[PDB]
Amino acid sequence: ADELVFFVNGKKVVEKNADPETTLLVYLRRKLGLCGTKLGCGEGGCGACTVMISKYDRLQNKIVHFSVNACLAPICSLHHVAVTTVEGIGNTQKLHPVQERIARSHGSQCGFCTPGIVMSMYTLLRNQPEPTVEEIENAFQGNLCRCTGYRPILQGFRTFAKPSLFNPEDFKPLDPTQEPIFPPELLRLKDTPQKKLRFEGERVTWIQASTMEELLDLKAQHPDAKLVVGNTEIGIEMKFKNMLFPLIVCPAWIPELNSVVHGPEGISFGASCPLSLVESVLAEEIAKLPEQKTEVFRGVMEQLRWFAGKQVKSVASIGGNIITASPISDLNPVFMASGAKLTLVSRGTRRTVRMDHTFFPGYRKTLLRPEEILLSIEIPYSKEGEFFSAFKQASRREDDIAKVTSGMRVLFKPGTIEVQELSLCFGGMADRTISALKTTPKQLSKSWNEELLQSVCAGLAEELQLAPDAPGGMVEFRRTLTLSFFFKFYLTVLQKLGRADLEDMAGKLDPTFASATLLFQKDPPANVQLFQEVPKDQSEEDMVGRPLPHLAANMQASGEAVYCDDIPRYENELSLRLVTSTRAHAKITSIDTSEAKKVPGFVCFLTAEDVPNSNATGLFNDETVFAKDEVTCVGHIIGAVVADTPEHAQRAARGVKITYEDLPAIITIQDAINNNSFYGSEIKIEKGDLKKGFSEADNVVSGELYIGGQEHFYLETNCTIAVPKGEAGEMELFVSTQNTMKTQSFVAKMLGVPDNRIVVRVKRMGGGFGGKETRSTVVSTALALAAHKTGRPVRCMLDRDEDMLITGGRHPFLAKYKVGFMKTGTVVALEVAHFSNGGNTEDLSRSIMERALFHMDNAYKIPNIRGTGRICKTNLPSNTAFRGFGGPQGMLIAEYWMSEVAITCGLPAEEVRRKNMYKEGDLTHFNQKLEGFTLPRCWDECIASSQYLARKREVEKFNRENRWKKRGLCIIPTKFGISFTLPFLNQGGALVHVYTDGSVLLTHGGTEMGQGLHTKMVQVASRALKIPTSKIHISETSTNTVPNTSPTAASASADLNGQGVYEACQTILKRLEPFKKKKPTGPWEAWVMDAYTSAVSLSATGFYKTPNLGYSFETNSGNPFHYFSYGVACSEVEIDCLTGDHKNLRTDIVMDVGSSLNPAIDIGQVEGAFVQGLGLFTMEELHYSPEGSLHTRGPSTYKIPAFGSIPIEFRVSLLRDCPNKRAIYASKAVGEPPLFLASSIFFAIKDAIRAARAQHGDNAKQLFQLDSPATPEKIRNACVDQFTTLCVTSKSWSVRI
């Protein structure tokens, strides 16, 4: 047959013309309008698209449930399966416990990921009714969240396993019986033998083989037939490497390729077995068999522990991992280094082989003949006197690509410690999986002793050398790892020999080298949130200062909250796709649409010619809407393809051929300095006398810190929907932005119509953090022009690779400091020269650099200081705002030389800091008096509650007992100024309406992206009008209701809008008091009607502007801030000196948010900001080619904090009794300040690294270089030792920007 049949949320679905290229994600959103399931990457790493799927296991005669990635599952593979999505488990009317909990525990912010996480937890509970705290966490390996900081999510879900922010005592019980039945129709079908299905598509044919005979026969007749199972590999090739296999064939049904046979030599799994099957089956073996027969099994298991996540492993097969033949495969190494027996069948033919250097001929190739297919794999039992180990190291533990992976085996002569057989296989060292065929033989018969260790290391170092210009980069780090892995193996093997009586022969192991053999250990979380209780009085209706859940939590948790792309398409609507340059600075000589036009559905290709009025946009008018004559960065927008479906828009854009003539490019900060290529003159602040200050300097340190950039990674990429009104140049735009005003102004200026005609509407954003403060417009305008030219509605949702490439991000920094200080610690002179890489457009760069300079002093009084800034005009995607807006960069530099001051002085950091810290009443370097100073209490409470001193000791102790595992514990302070650097942007407006039924419709200039701004504004209004929040509502933000609004940024949004909403509300109360006075206790509904029937207006606007702001650089005077945010973080880490990986063991925060408008919201903002910082300083790295082209374009190569990447012990506390009167209800901004506190982790790692360096004889300087981010690479290399030494022996892949 050719009719695809399956279920979704219970309802049957029959598809008569299924296209192999159609993914369950597209079929759910665009063919069933089920939009709970989101699209965050289409790469497989965020899990926003997670959905459960069920089916009847023919074999086990049972129904099974497992999660999967909708973005990668081809529907042509879902025949006779039951899909379940977030919508299918609950609604706001009837929330499923999973949804209720995540929502109430505050686990949802922007909400764009809650459906996926909800589904992972849901799927778990369907498999394990009462999971363990550990099982719960493993559920989220394939799920990423950028707003929550993961604490709440897990704390909330904890309740399912084994004052206050919420109450699990109120959570509704779970009832497994009340879950969606399993489609009886599907059980009726399990009675008739499945047959072969064929699905013809627009350009791809898919055959679903049902029997081995069919499969081999098909391969025989058409060897070209591409096999597909989980598609987790092929899916990526088609989607990202622009591949197209016209003839697929899925054999997932065939029994043979699914059997698990227990043989004498070991367990044989069919080539199609899901990695989750292998995982579960082996896990049972290593639990009932002698530890001596499960060495290899446990090796595989260790790899799978960090192999994608639940979603991928549920469909990814073993055979797929084998045949993919990826040099970075984490299983081929283990399979080769253990001689796995692979069977290979073909119609008529049948052979068998063992994995070895011969199996992987060249790049991604194997022994298999074009017509053969991998039948099965036998994972061998470990023989007595045989030991195995598996290693893997990347940039992040959870779901990542290995930099180096390895499988190591050793077989000793019976009863001895003499090497009978030794295999060492690696991944990430060549264009394939290799073995140390040379090094290992020269080790036969030798004994497991220190001499062999030296023999191998020297051998590996020689045999596995890398070309400095080798692909991937990080040459040193990788080499070190091959050696560091073997070292762990050597130390491990010893322990195993000792644990066999031959202890005496191999020799006891140093009790400080033991930890170096340990496998990664979990250790249960322990969080503690602390905030103030609202006065004993405060009526229960006054929610200001109460932990009120984000108003949209339930909706976000249920998939009903709507996001731009969720809005349905007009039958009308067209799709748009941007066309960017592939040259950093060329001259466009010719554009060719010839091919684009052949694409079915092609409407047109917009260029600079098609712009009605002006082609000059951007916050400083130095940018083009569409490149004209020359491109000035890779990812520069040249045009826009317009077609019906997004699929055709893309294929068409690919048909737009361009020709260039390159020009001198200015890629790096250096390139810029050498070319005097900047954005304006240099900014400078200076107080005191430098020469004089340096003269009195006992010490004087110089240095250069470099801070990497950072991609915002809002789960919801950029999206705009433009609907043309047909008359007067009227246009409504549904946009994911934090800046309606400029989105509007840019579309107006671009079209040639007044702002009169343009309306921009923002309901909510799935995260923004400054990335949508002005860069969204680059998409907005393109669509506006598509609408204005077709008359039809046009829409554009950017894919991740396009968003990351195009939208820019945080500013990379280069500091050149020279601090002068006394032996006492006291600093007396500072001089920093910052250099930010601005990019293609000025944008907000120069204002970011002004913020940096404003915080180069972090928390310290420095009598003689002078900082300067220069913004580099480079041929790269222009960079913008990012939570912190230059503040972190400027503070990381400050805390860097500060740390080196402590070291050089030999004094304890805490003391060096407390000494130089500001005092209540001091002026800053820009002369702003610091009144209501509160940092000291944050400091004294943090040391006290985090029990610093005592733990400082426990850390030293741990270090004395551990050689290849060191711990750090650093306490950092921060000072963040609140207000826009541009004074007039400090204004907010609101519009309130009270209808005759009493209900109130409120709106303000600020947008919503996860911060819970509306929730707060609602709480403000509710307290202002003295009526329950239940009667108030905010539906969206738009230029209709409130005009000329500042972008939602600078943490000020709740300060500005909250003040506006307040005034508006006071106007209403004014009007209403005459009626109130008459009937004092009469209901609110009553006063409203009276006012109405008395012709009294029940609608008013509210406005506010921050007073007394205004700073002059020319005279270094005038306060540029309304007030200051204050806080202290105390983090503890524990690095693995042998790999670079580490783990944040504990953090303690004490933040000053004045009288919090909403404790729960703020604490969630503190945790979230922090985790964003922790990623900026230790995980997130962007790599650009030498030619200025970005390489890291998806979560696969950009690793943002994951679930397990957060302080195992997260403690947050809000400073008590610290009312900030001058702000809405004595509160304080809280969105950005908390982010730099993640520094404490950076410098705790600094310590742990120094402690390791201190036990290595060779001095080689004590004040080493540790640039940001402190990735595994930077950390390992910094731990110079016998291994970093024996392996350090242009044309490189990347380059420092």
Ligand SMILES: Cc1cc2nc3c(=O)[nH]c(=O)nc-3n(C[C@H](O)[C@H](O)[C@H](O)COP(=O)(O)OP(=O)(O)OC[C@H]3O[C@@H](n4cnc5c(N)ncnc54)[C@H](O)[C@@H]3O)c2cc1C
């Ligand atoms: C987010 C994410 C994270 C990942 N993490 C990791 C990781 O940590 N380590 C790692 O190694 N991989 C990882 N992978 C890669 C991938 O999941 C594996 O390579 C997977 O095991 C491939 O299996 P599949 O069934 O999905 O293959 P498919 O994509 O269906 O097929 C892959 C290739 O195998 C061939 N093939 C499949 N079965 C057979 C057979 N029986 N006989 C002959 N040829 C066959 C096909 O022709 C095709 O070329 C990740 C992928 C994603 C998307």
Ligand SMILES: O=C(O)c1ccccc1O
């Ligand atoms: O001044 C700004 O424009 C600004 C923007 C985002 C965040 C903080 C800021 O000061």
Ligand code: FES
């Ligand atoms: S979209 Fe499918 S994993 Fe992120």
Ligand code: FES
């Ligand atoms: S709350 Fe999850 S991506 Fe924002």
Ligand SMILES: [Ca+2]
């Ligand atoms: Ca810029």
